[PDB]
C-alpha cells in the first residue's frame, strides 16, 4: 500500500495527515537511538574519569 | 666548638615530627567527585487539543 500511494497524489486526506505525520516522526526516532551511546561515553568518561 | 644535646633534640624532633603530620592528612581524601543531576518526571505530557 505504502509504495503504491507514494507520490500518487490519490490519498483521501485523513489518511494523507495521518501519514505525513509518521515520516515527521522519523527525525525523533534518530535522535531517540543516540541515547544509548551518550550512556555509555558518560559513564566510562564522567564516572570513571578515563 | 662545642655542641649541647637539648638543642640538637630540638630540632631532630621537630624535622621528623612535620612528617607524621602528612601521614595524616592523607587519610581523608581518598576519592574522585561524580557530577550530580536532579529529578523531574521527565515523561510529563500534555494533550495537543
Given at each position: 500500500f505504502l509504495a503504491a500511494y507514494d507520490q500518487s497524489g490519490k490519498?483521501?486526506?485523513h489518511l494523507t495527515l495521518f501519514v505525513s505525520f509518521?515520516?515527521?516522526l522519523e527525525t525523533?526516532?534518530?535522535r531517540f537511538?543516540?541515547?544509548?551511546?551518550?550512556?555509555l561515553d558518560f559513564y566510562y568518561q564522567e564516572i570513571l574519569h578515563l | 666548638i662545642n655542641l649541647n644535646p637539648v638543642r640538637v633534640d630540638n630540632?631532630?624532633?621537630k624535622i621528623l615530627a612535620s612528617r607524621l603530620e602528612n601521614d595524616l592528612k592523607a587519610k581523608d581524601?581518598?576519592?574522585?567527585?561524580i557530577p550530580q543531576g536532579t529529578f523531574a518526571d521527565w515523561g510529563e505530557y500534555s494533550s495537543i487539543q
Amino acid at each position: 500500500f505504502l509504495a503504491a500511494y507514494d507520490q500518487s497524489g490519490k490519498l483521501t486526506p485523513h489518511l494523507t495527515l495521518f501519514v505525513s505525520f509518521l515520516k515527521l516522526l522519523e527525525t525523533s526516532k534518530k535522535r531517540f537511538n543516540q541515547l544509548t551511546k551518550r550512556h555509555l561515553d558518560f559513564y566510562y568518561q564522567e564516572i570513571l574519569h578515563l | 666548638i662545642n655542641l649541647n644535646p637539648v638543642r640538637v633534640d630540638n630540632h631532630k624532633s621537630k624535622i621528623l615530627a612535620s612528617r607524621l603530620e602528612n601521614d595524616l592528612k592523607a587519610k581523608d581524601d581518598l576519592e574522585p567527585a561524580i557530577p550530580q543531576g536532579t529529578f523531574a518526571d521527565w515523561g510529563e505530557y500534555s494533550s495537543i487539543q
